[PDB]
Structures are given as C-alpha cells and as structure tokens.
C-alpha cells in the first residue's frame, strides 16, 4: 500500500542527498561581495486609494499595473507618474494582476473565482473554470495566460476560446503563486503544502517537485538563466538541474511576502511584512542592504526587463518605485 | 546680577518654545501623517506656536530685560499685532481640534463625511483669518499717551471697550465651546464604558481628558481675568503682576500644547 510510496520517497531523498557534491558556500567564499547598495525612491507612484495587492511590470519596461483592494485597476507610466488608464474591476476584490507582453491586454484576477482579461485597445473574455480565488496570473502569450487558484489546481487558458486547454493538479495545499520562465517551456508554482513543483508546459508532469521550505510557500521567481528558481522568513533557492536546495536564506522573524531577482541575478530583492525589503546576495548568500519607504506590509515586488530599477507595491497605498 | 539669571531662564524658555513645535512640524512634514484632518490641525497649531515663540517671545524678553526698546514704533505695533494674532490662533486651533473630536465621537457615521482636505484647509484658513489683530494696527485702537507717542516705551494701554470684546471673541467663546464639547465627549465615553461593563467581570479616560482641559484652563484663565479686571477696574492691578503673569503664562501654553498633542515613531525617526 502506502509503504511503496514511502519507499519511493525515501529513495528520492537518498538520491538527492547523495547528489550533493559540494556546498554552494564553498564557491561563495571566493566571490567578491556585492557591496552595500542603497536604493533610492527616484519616483513615487502614489494616488491609489487602497491596499495595492498587485505590482507587475510591462515588457516595454515603461508601464506598470496595480490592482486595488476595492476594485480599481490603474496603469502607471513610471516616467511621468501619470495614470494612463483606470479601469475598475467588476469584482470588488482583486488578488493578482499581470501585464501581457504584447500589451494589448492587461490581466486582472480576483477573489470571485473568475479571471477576466481586460482590453487596453472593456473585458475581452472571462475565465471561470478554476475553483476559488485567482491566486496569480502571468500572460505567457497573447492567447495563453496561466492562472492559479486556491483549489490546489493550476490551469492553462486559451484566451480566445476561453476554456482550459490543459490542467495541472497534485499539490496538497492551496497554491499561492506561480511564475513562468523566459523560455516559456516550463513554469513553477508555490503551494500551501510547503512544496514547489516545476510543471511542464504541455505534459503536465512535475519535473522536480521540491518541498524544502517549512511553512507555506508565498512566492517564487525564476532565475534569469531559467535553470533555477527561489510563511517562514527563510526564502530557499533551488537549482532545477540538481533539484536540491541551492542555499538556505537570521534576526529577521517576519514573513516573506515576495521574491524577485536582478538582471545579473546577484541581487535577490526580497520584501517582507516587516515593511522593509531586504536585498540579499544570491551567490555569496549574504544580506547586503535593505530599503524601506512605506508603512504597511509589502504586497509584491518586481524588476523591469531592462533591469533599470524595481517596484515595491505595499498595502500603504504608496508604490515607491525604488531606483 | 539676578537679572542675568532671569534672562538665562527666559532664553531657555524661548528655546523650549521653539523646539517643542519645530520637532512636531518637522515630523509632520517628513512623515506620511499628513492629509489627516486631526494631524493637519495639530500641525497647524504647532506652526502657530512656532511662529509665536520665534517672533513674540524674544522681543518681549528684550523689552522686559532691557528697559529701553531699541527699535521703532512702526515695527513695535507690528509686534503687538503679531502677538495678538498668534495667541488668537493658538486658542482657535485648541478649540478647533476639540470641535473635530466632538463631531468624530458624536456622529462617526458622519465623522469622515464632514471632514475633508478642502474642508480642513477652509477651517484652518478661517481660524487664522479670525482681523482682530489687523484692526489695532490700522484703527490705532490699541492717560499715558506719551508711551503710545514716545520712542523709549511700549506699554499696552488700550480702550476699555476694545479689550472686553477682544478677550471675549478670543477666549470666552472658545472656552465655552471647548468645555461643552469635552463634557459631551466625557459623557459619551462614560456611557460606552458602562455598556462595556455590562459584560460580567473580566476611569483613566477621565484623567486623560482632564489633563488636556486643565492645561488650557490653568494656562489661560488668569491672564484674561486680569485683562478684564484692568479694563474695568483701573487702580486695582499693578503693571509687574500683569506682565509677568500674562506673558509667560500664555506663552508657556504653546509648549504645553505641543506636549499635549504614532508621533513617537516620527520623533524617534530623526
């Protein structure tokens, strides 16, 4: 019965343990430190009367989109701090948002268990196949946007048809965040089961399902190279090629809120509910410096494709876009 | 050389009067507490106290210490008007925050409805405008005519009729409004406390309200009482008792007010 599954789990654990050839810290030792780099709020995207729970960059590296706690969705020009469009959401609560690389449409999730894609140039279509609140979205293509739901079942959509092309299921706990790789041939998802499984684009099979973290996995982001990714304060990093824990990431006691790497990957912009995002070295595994401009807990972060600067969307209604 | 020590004490008082409002104003400007009607009103009162301490206090201190007034009357009347305006602004803001709190308690379903950033700006502007200090400069309404004419002296010998109405419109109506509003607040808090006490098993607010009421009371009542007395009764009041008591007491009020005025994080931020 379950003894066979337990034996398989033990064999997987043993293979992973023996796979450990050397410690990452050994390589980190020779790595020269990044240095204390203090970000500055060269702009202040403010003027949004809610606890902004969404913060997604645009592929053009010019515009960002945020979702209200009351239902107002506003697109922002980071250069002019002028809100280009403000389309309110039919559902009062929005739990996530995403900007399509084509830019023709902007994705806006919600807690109404229905995902609606808005047409920048009204709602183009509504997706409601999944069950429970839309955990996260990231428009992979102009017709394929990946959703995420509290039903422990992430799904792929065809925007034109408005039906779930495929299905992904198997996670014990509710999935709370998903991220897509630049290669677009794979993605990852962090669930409440303290586990992460890198699903396939079409097959729907977990390439390397890891469960290193202790508490629920709030968020996960891809490394720029696409060969690795990363409620407890610790935010571990895993190398998909080795399926192990690349490095374990001490006085911090708050909860991890969002994760985002840098263009060179050295900086791992991590924001907490302690109101001060802590930026840690990805290779040297050291805490270099922090930033803090807002008051309420941080909701989401992000980095532009050009990598010029970063955004910090908190619940304090102020999206201080640090530079 | 006791005058030297008295002047040192006065200098310390002036420095405290400046700092006790400058710190609050700087914290309000640097932090995100702004746009709140209560925070905006507190900042306005602190600005009034800062202006009063910066302008009126040192000139009056120099007048007390050195008998001669080394400057001219054209700016001396400006000093008198500025002092009148600052005292009026402090009292008016102390009453305005009371009115805001009273409406917040008595109608929470309209507390956020009535208050607004534009409404707060209008209220603050009206309070500052409420003329009573510009009239003495223009109308010259501010028997020892030599001091009003000579250059050495500056003694406040004004109309008995002007003094009564000025003191009334500056303090009496604010006093009645503050007392009534705060008594209503105390009654509402007592009723809420009893309603909570309806829970079986398992009054500091009285002291909390009493501190902020008594500060204004014991800092302002005697000076205006003496003002009315000297307007009515001429030979009863000595000059030195009037001066010491009036100036210093009302002025100390601004510092006491900053202290009476969340802010700890802003204060600790610097």
């Amino acid at each position: 019965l379950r003894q066979e599954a337990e034996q398989l789990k033990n064999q997987i654990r043993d293979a992973r343990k023996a796979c450990a050839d050397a410690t990452l810290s050994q390589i980190t030792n020779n790595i020269d430190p990044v240095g204390r780099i203090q970000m500055r709020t060269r702009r202040t995207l403010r003027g949004h009367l809610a606890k902004i729970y969404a913060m997604h960059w645009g592929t053009d590296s010019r515009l960002l989109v945020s979702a209200s706690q009351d239902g107002k969705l506003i697109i922002w020009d980071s250069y002019t701090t002028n809100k280009v469009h403000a389309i309110p959401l039919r559902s009062s609560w929005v739990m996530t948002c995403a900007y399509a690389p084509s830019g023709n449409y902007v994705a806006c999730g919600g807690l109404d268990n229905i995902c609606s894609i808005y047409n920048l140039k009204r709602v183009s279509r509504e997706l409601a196949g999944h069950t429970g609140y839309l955990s996260c979205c990231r428009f992979l293509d102009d017709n394929q946007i990946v959703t995420s739901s509290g039903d422990t079942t992430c799904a792929l959509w065809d925007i034109e048809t408005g039906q779930q092309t495929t299905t992904f299921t198997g996670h014990t706990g509710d999935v709370m965040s998903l991220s897509l790789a630049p290669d677009t041939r794979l993605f990852v998802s962090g669930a409440c089961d303290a586990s992460a499984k890198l699903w396939d684009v079409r097959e729907g099979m977990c390439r390397q399902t890891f469960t290193g973290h202790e508490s629920d996995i709030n968020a996960i982001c891809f490394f720029p190279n696409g060969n690795a990714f990363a409620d407890d304060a610790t935010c571990r990093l895993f190398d998909l090629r080795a399926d192990q824990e690349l490095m374990t990431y001490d006085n911090i006691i708050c909860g991890i809120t969002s994760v985002s790497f840098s263009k060179s990957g050295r900086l791992l912009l991590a924001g907490y509910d302690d109101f001060n995002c802590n930026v840690w070295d990805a290779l040297k595994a050291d805490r270099a410096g922090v930033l803090a401009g807002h008051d309420n807990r941080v909701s989401c972060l992000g980095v532009t494709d050009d990598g010029m600067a970063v955004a910090t969307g908190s619940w304090d209604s102020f999206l201080k876009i640090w530079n | 050389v006791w005058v030297v020590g008295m002047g040192i004490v006065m200098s310390l008082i002036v420095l405290a009067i400046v700092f006790g409002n400058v710190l609050v104003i700087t914290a309000i400007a640097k932090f995100e507490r702004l746009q709140t009607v209560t925070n905006y009103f507190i900042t306005s009162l602190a600005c009034a106290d800062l202006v009063m301490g910066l302008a009126v206090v040192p000139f009056g201190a120099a007048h007390i210490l050195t008998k001669t007034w080394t400057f001219g009357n054209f700016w001396c009347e400006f000093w008198t008007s500025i002092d009148v305006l600052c005292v009026t602004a402090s009292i008016e803001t102390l009453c305005v925050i009371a009115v805001d709190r009273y409406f917040a308690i008595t109608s929470p379903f309209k507390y956020q409805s009535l208050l607004t950033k534009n409404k707060a700006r209008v209220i603050i502007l009206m309070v500052w405008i409420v003329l009573t200090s510009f009239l003495p400069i223009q109308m010259h309404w501010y028997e020892a005519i030599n001091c009003y004419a000579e250059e050495t002296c500056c003694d406040f010998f004004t109309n008995q009729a002007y003094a009564i109405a000025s003191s009334i419109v500056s303090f009496y109506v604010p006093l009645v409004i503050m007392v009534f509003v705060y008594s209503r607040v105390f009654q509402e808090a007592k009723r809420q406390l009893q309603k909570i006490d309806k829970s079986e098993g398992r009054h500091k607010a009285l002291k909390t309200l009493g501190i902020i009421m008594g500060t204004f009371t014991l800092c302002w009542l005697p000076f205006f009482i003496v003002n009315i007395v000297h307007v009515i009764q001429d030979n009863l009041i000595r000059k030195e008792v009037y001066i010491l008591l009036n100036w210093i007491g009302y002025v100390n009020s601004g510092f006491n007010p900053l202290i009476y005025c969340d802010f700890r994080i802003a204060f600790q931020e610097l």
């Binding site: 003027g47 009367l49 280009v84 469009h85 807690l111 | 507390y111």
Partner: protein, 313 residues
Amino acid sequence: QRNEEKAQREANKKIEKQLQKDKQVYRATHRLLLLGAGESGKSTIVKQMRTKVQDIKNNLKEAIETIVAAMSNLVNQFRVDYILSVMNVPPEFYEHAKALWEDEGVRACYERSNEYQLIAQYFLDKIDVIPSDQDLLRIFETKFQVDKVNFHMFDVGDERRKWIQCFNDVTAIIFVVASSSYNMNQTNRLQEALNLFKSIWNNRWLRTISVILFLNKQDLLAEKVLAGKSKIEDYFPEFARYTTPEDATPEPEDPRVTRAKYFIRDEFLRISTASRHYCYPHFTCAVDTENIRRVFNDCRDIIQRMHLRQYEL
C-alpha cells in the same frame, strides 16, 4: 513636440478627477464580512436581513434522500432505491421519495440525525405536503445600506482560510454560530465553531477587527434544551459546574434554557475577552426582524469604541 506630454497630463487629470469623485463613496461605505460556519444558518440571517424555489425543494429532497442514503450508511424498499438511484440530477421518483419520507425509516433518521447532515425536516414534511409562503426561507455580496449609513455586506464562505487574511479593513466580521448544533466527526460542532472564533480573534492580520457573534437558532437550542435526551453536560462537562450568571434578562423564560444560553454566551465571551477586538453577542431567531437595527447599533458602537481608542480618552 510637447503634445504627448500635454495629452498625458490631461488624461492624468481626468483619471484623478474620477478617482477623487469615487473616493467619497469608497470611504463612505462600511464593509462587513459574514464569515459563518458551514450549515449554521448563515443564509437565514442573510435572508431576514435583506422557479428556483421548486428547484430548491427538489434539491433539498434529493439531499434529504442523500441523508436517507447516508442514514443507511450510519447505524417502500423499492421506493427508497428509486430516489437513491435517481439521486444524481443533471413523477414516479417524486412519489417514491414522498413514500420513503412517509416510511418509518425517514422518521427514525430524522430522530437520530445528530451524526447525519441535513440542510430541513420542516421542508421535508412540506415537500411531502407539496412555492409556499416562507417555505423557501425555511461571494454572495450584499448591499443593504441603512437609511442613515451605507452598509454593504460581503460574503466569503477553506480550511487554511487565507481568504480571512486577505481582508483587513472590514468594519466588523459577522460570525453566525448555531447554538443548537452542539450535540452534532471527532469534535462537536459548537466546539469547532469556538475553535474558529479563537482563530479569528487570535489572528495576526485581523488584529483590529471586532466580531458580532449572533448566536443563531437560539429557539432551536432552547427546544433541544427542553428535552433531556442529550444534556449539555455530556457534551460539555464544564456545564455541570456552571451555574446561572449573576446578571440575567430572561425573555417574558425557562431557567434551564436560560442557564444553557448564558453558558454558551459566556463560553464564547471567555475566548473573546482573552485578548482591540470587542465581541458583541446576541440571541436571535429567524422571526426576529430587528437584526439590521441591532447590527446598526453595534456598528455605531464600533467606531465610537474605536475613535476613543484611536489615541484619545
């Protein structure tokens, strides 16, 4: 060319004007989350506060038959098979179900239904009698603004309950708990509701939110109290040590039922006053139409109890 800058400035001005117009209503509206226990009558309070009827009756009767099939799992034979086989739905079955409800097995299942789950026996008799008056009554957002204040009720309805952690600015969280469902599966339903209330009150995110716990179905609780089939002592041992509270305001009226109701309220209030958030209990039945008025008085007693705590007396 500065035309682009001028156009963007005009658009930003229009958007800011619209946002300023909306902010008045956005702040004016008061929001409440009606987090209620499953099958605790949360609909009944919502129905009172505010084609499918026949469909509901068929749904309930099938659920009643589903309970009857589950009644077989616990502890006219062909008629029972007819409904159970036709239980799934995308005349003869109707009559077979009516007969099965008339069968003594239905009476036995209704009598021993603590372990069983039901929506409903009054409607089941009514369905057998069979819409009728009050038969249907016996994120679903709600916008029922009082003539004085704008009140909007939000329904969530999730073991992890991160949906709770999502909300942090509701004026109050309605926690409808059915007092009667205490004999009704390792732990009793009342104890599970108490655990849920403890979790909500002791929530890190929901630090500054009060709960208005309306003890629903108090009439059913009193009725079950009138019979001594299952004393509260057997379910809750501490009941025997408990005695009547010093303060009591009985309606018109049963000392035993009064003791039971006050015990339940005190049990809730202990966890409520453990640790701010102020719990406002009530004793309500479905017929009581003053629910909206009580909620309004509680809400007016929230902000007043909040501003005084907001760095004041």
